Amino acid sequence: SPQSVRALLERHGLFADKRFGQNFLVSEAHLRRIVEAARPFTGPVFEVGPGLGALTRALLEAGAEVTAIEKDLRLRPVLEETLSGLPVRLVFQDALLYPWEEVPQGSLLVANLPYHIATPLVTRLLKTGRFARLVFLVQKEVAERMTARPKTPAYGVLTLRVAHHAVAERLFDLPPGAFFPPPKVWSSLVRLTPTGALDDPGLFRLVEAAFGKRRKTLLNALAAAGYPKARVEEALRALGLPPRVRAEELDLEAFRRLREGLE
């Protein structure tokens, strides 16, 4: 309950710290949903931000082999208490500094992610190609970006970054009350299933150029970013797109074809 979480924090003399984006998950039902979205545990599990150990314990109980990476050293006593008797590798480090590129092929990310590192962290883990599934909570707006369809406000670079590497599902929305202390926004449970592609720097130079100048048509954004105007005009024409088409109108395959057209 929010009651029990509040009481656990108080007993350990802890306060939720905004510098760590600390919002701890309350309900067993939400923990269950996260575990069920991530199972079966066919590879090692990495959890970023175990916090009070609620999800960590659920994972371990489900038979997962877990490495949990926590930046706040103050959470060590509560984590040791919650996880007493259970095989966990507890690592106290900034997860943005963890050697992600070397995790075993087939690893799973399962985590209530700290809002302020979620986007760069997920981007990096997707680039590794090492994960079978990534299952995590993120702010609802970030979830919407990760699962956007073309021609919408949320559609952009992050959408295309996730799509290039993976299929994306928004499985459930969680109200601020699902956490203690409650955040100011809703969160969502997201599942990413990598589909094989590693980074494609050329593709993302194009995508980032495409979305850099948001008030411009695709042609002008790309031209202003140093792509030869005539070649862009021709590639767009060749794809049967209107001269003044905008970046948000193109799906992943369309960007791939555009890139192939320009090269």
Ligand SMILES: Nc1ncnc2c1ncn2[C@@H]1O[C@H](CO)[C@@H](O)[C@H]1O
């Ligand atoms: N950079 C980070 N690496 C690992 N854990 C983090 C980081 N930033 C915040 N956390 C932890 O993530 C959890 C978010 O609820 C908290 O336990 C918080 O302390």
